[PDB]
Amino acid sequence: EKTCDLVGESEKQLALLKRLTPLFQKSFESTVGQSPDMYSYVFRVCREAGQHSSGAGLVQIQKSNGKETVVGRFNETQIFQGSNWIMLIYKGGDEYDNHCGREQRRAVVMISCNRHTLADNFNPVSECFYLFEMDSSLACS
Amino acid sequence: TCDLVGSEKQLALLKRLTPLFQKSFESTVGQSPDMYSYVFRVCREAGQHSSGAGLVQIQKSNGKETVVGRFNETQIFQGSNWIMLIYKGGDEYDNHCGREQRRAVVMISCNRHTLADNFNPVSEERGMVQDCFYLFEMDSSLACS
Ligand SMILES: *[C@@H]1O[C@H](CO)[C@@H](O)[C@H](O)[C@H]1NC(C)=O
Ligand SMILES: *[C@@H]1O[C@H](CO)[C@@H](O)[C@H](O)[C@H]1NC(C)=O
Numbered sequence A: 001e002k003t004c005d006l007v008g009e010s011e012k013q014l015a016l017l018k019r020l021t022p023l024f025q026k027s028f029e030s031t032v033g034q035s036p037d038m039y040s041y042v043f044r045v046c047r048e049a050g051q052h053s054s055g056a057g058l059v060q061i062q063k064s065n066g067k068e069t070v071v072g073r074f075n076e077t078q079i080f081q082g083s084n085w086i087m088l089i090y091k092g093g094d095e096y097d098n099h100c101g102r103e104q105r106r107a108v109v110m111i112s113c114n115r116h117t118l119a120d121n122f123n124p125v126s127e128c129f130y131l132f133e134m135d136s137s138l139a140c141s
Numbered sequence B: 001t002c003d004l005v006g007s008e009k010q011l012a013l014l015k016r017l018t019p020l021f022q023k024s025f026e027s028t029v030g031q032s033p034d035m036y037s038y039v040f041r042v043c044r045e046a047g048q049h050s051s052g053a054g055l056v057q058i059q060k061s062n063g064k065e066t067v068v069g070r071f072n073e074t075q076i077f078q079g080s081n082w083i084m085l086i087y088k089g090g091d092e093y094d095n096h097c098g099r100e101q102r103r104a105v106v107m108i109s110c111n112r113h114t115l116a117d118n119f120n121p122v123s124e125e126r127g128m129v130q131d132c133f134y135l136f137e138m139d140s141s142l143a144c145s
Helices: A011-019 B008-016 B125-130
Strands: A028-032 A039-043 A056-062 A068-081 A085-092 A107-113 A120-126 A130-136 B025-029 B036-040 B053-059 B065-078 B082-089 B104-110 B117-121 B134-140
Touching: A011 A068, A028 A120, A039 A120, A039 A130, A056 A107, A056 A130, A085 B104, A107 B082, A120 B065, B008 B065, B025 B117, B036 B117, B036 B134, B053 B104, B053 B134
Parallel strands: A107 A130, B104 B134
Antiparallel strands: A028 A039, A039 A056, A056 A068, A068 A085, A085 A107, A120 A130, B025 B036, B036 B053, B053 B065, B065 B082, B082 B104, B117 B134
16 A cells, blocks of 8 residues: 655645545556667556566666666655646666666656646656656646 | 756757846745745856856845856756756755755746746745755746747
């Protein structure tokens, strides 16, 4: 019954967490790259993404063989709300092998207000920083 | 002007933002005594005592300026209806957040009715320090796609 664990205990962030509950059971996926280097990014809200990555909230899957690399874990979550957007952050991903000071990967998902959908249009923006975006009326105010 | 921490993509993005270079943005948050004024500029000096600052925090009680981020260390990304501008290399925290260098993150949302407006931090000095993250927002049709 594990959900998001806030990095630190902002109640403003806990309320934000309850506001996104409607997305907890949805699964977001997007595939970029081209054969044979196609990678599938699967993202979940406060639930585990991927098939072999316990605690991962967003994983990168090599389409060729299904090898999973954790980008972020929902047990190290941060969440902020702007005028018409919500920023979700998952820390504690797998460390880089020979890049970025070999630091733990991290996922940043920019959820934009879209009054015409509860959830949709998830995709990576630019892949020491993994940026993604998606639309949701939940990020509307 | 801005110095990328790089990318042709961010370079085009920097030029796409030129229309905002000579404007200055300010927003004051929190109430007496501990009120703070945040001054933000695009690829241009924002501080009065802080050289190379892209975004500064001014303690209103005494005028102490803190560099939140420098434009000589810029990063820029564009989403569907937003643009994320990042200024790293701000002054280090004194007794918070591992005493690491501050950085400013500004979320520019698409707004097809203003070239630029509604600049403000997403939280107050207090909350921002607690979260070890200085996040700001503003509107601009330049962030529209
Ligand atoms: C998150 O969960 C992972 C499980 O592998 C653990 O290693 C890590 O310490 C946890 N992070 C925190 C700070 O809770
Ligand atoms: C940015 O400028 C400051 C001087 O104010 C300097 O300390 C820092 O090393 C510079 N960073 C880069 C990108 O060279």
